[PDB]
Amino acid sequence: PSTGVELYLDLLKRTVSNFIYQDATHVAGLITQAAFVEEARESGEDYPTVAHTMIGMKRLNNLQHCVESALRDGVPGDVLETGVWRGGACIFARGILKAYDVRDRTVWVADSFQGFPKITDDDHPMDAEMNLHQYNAAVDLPTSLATVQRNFSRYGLLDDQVRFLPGWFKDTMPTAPFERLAVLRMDGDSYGATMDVLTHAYPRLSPGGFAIIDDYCIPACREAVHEYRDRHGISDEIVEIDRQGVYWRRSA
């Protein structure tokens, strides 16, 4: 990075993922030690105790790629992340728009702001077995709307181009008041959250727009992706980002 924009976006990635102060990770899943590990934060594989995003540098770089490509190529629409936790990825998205002085696109921040949902008999069997709800406390996942707003304000990026969609995706997505998306970033882990958002938000993704599946390594997530793509006859190349995420670019 040499230009002001390049320096800003580089620093913003380093800051939301907190390579700057390198906070400890929660101990959960495959992470058995609390110590900061560079490689884990680089590929977004730990559970930061303090950092504002857990998606890591490779998926932040991907988000930047997708937003910049949409801007460059004149792909119409907003940016939506479904599953935002402390807000770091959406903060970075808003910063990208800020850096290029884009005044006519919005970052939509969608989340229960309550962590993973309690499982009921309505849930897909794979979601029920996985029961993501059980690790809400373990990785400090429930994060209120007020806290996420607090966090945008800390980098000076809380403004009218950031809009919030509080609630469960099955409830908020069908009538969410955006008309077009240039980037749809899905990070809700489950079959349910993935299918909710593909069903109700993907049709508003512009041709040339990007669909990012953060959690593709999770079998329930991946099953929703393939079910949805099969149903709609979507054959757009699935491109791998790191050990967790993939994306495709919508051809039509």
Ligand X SMILES: CC[C@H]1OC(=O)/C=C/[C@H](C)[C@@H](O[C@@H]2O[C@H](C)C[C@H](N(C)C)[C@H]2O)[C@@H](C)C[C@@H](C)C(=O)/C=C/C=C/[C@@H]1CO[C@@H]1O[C@H](C)[C@@H](O)[C@@H](OC)[C@H]1OC
**Residue 123 lies near ligand X (rule: CB under 6 A):** no
Are 193 and 114 a contacting pair, CB within 8 Å? Answer: no
Are 144 and 88 a contacting pair, CB within 8 Å? Answer: no
Q: Give the residue, chosen from 45, 46, 78, 111, that forms a contact with ligand SAH under the rule CB under 6 A.
A: 111
What SS3 class is residue 249? strand
**Residue 15 lies near a second copy (rule: CB under 8 A):** yes
Rounded distance, CA 75 to CA 47, Å?
A: 33
Q: Answer with the entry of Mg ion, ligand X, ligand SAH, none that 48 interacts with (C-beta below 5 to 8 A by kind).
A: none
Tell me, residue by residue from 65 to 104, as one string, x for binding to ligand X by CB under 6 A and - for no binding.
Answer: ------------------x---------------------
Is 85 a known ligand-binding residue? yes
Q: What is the DSSP letter of 118?
A: P
For tokens 């119409």, the residue is: 76
Are 212 and 66 a contacting pair, CB within 8 Å? Answer: yes
In the range 136-155, which residues lie near a second copy by CB under 8 A?
154-155
Q: Give the residue, chosen from 47, 108, 164, 169, that forms a contact with ligand SAH under the rule CB under 6 A.
A: 169
Other residues' Cβ atoms within 10 Å of the Cβ of residue 231: 10
The radius of gyration of the chain's CA atoms, rounded to the nearest angstrom, is: 17
Nearest residue (beta carbon) to ligand SAH: 83
Rounded distance, CA 13 to CA 41, Å?
A: 11
Tell me, residue by residue from 170 to 209, as one string, x for binding to a second copy by CB under 8 A and - for no binding.
Answer: ----------------------------------------
For tokens 């809380």, the residue is: 158
Q: How many CA atoms lie within 13 A of 141 on its CB side?
A: 21
In the range 215-234, which residues lie near ligand X by CB under 6 A?
215, 217-219
Rounded distance, CA 57 to CA 161, Å?
A: 24
Distance from first CA to last CA of the chain, Å, rounded?
34
**Residue 168 lies near ligand SAH (rule: CB under 6 A):** yes
Size of the site for Mg ion (CB under 5 A): 3
Kind and range of the H or E run holding 80: strand 78-82
**Residue 135 lies near a second copy (rule: CB under 8 A):** no
Kind and range of the H or E run holding 69: helix 56-73
**Residue 187 lies near ligand SAH (rule: CB under 6 A):** yes
Q: Which residues are annotated as a binding site for Mg(2+)?
A: 187, 214-215
Interacting residues with ligand X (CB under 6 A): 28-29, 47, 83, 130, 132, 135, 139, 141, 187, 189, 214-215, 217-219, 244
Interacting residues with ligand SAH (CB under 6 A): 53-55, 81, 83-85, 88-89, 111-112, 114-117, 141, 168-169, 187-190, 192-193
Interacting residues with a second copy (CB under 8 A): 1-8, 10-12, 14-15, 18-23, 50, 52, 95, 98-99, 101, 154-156
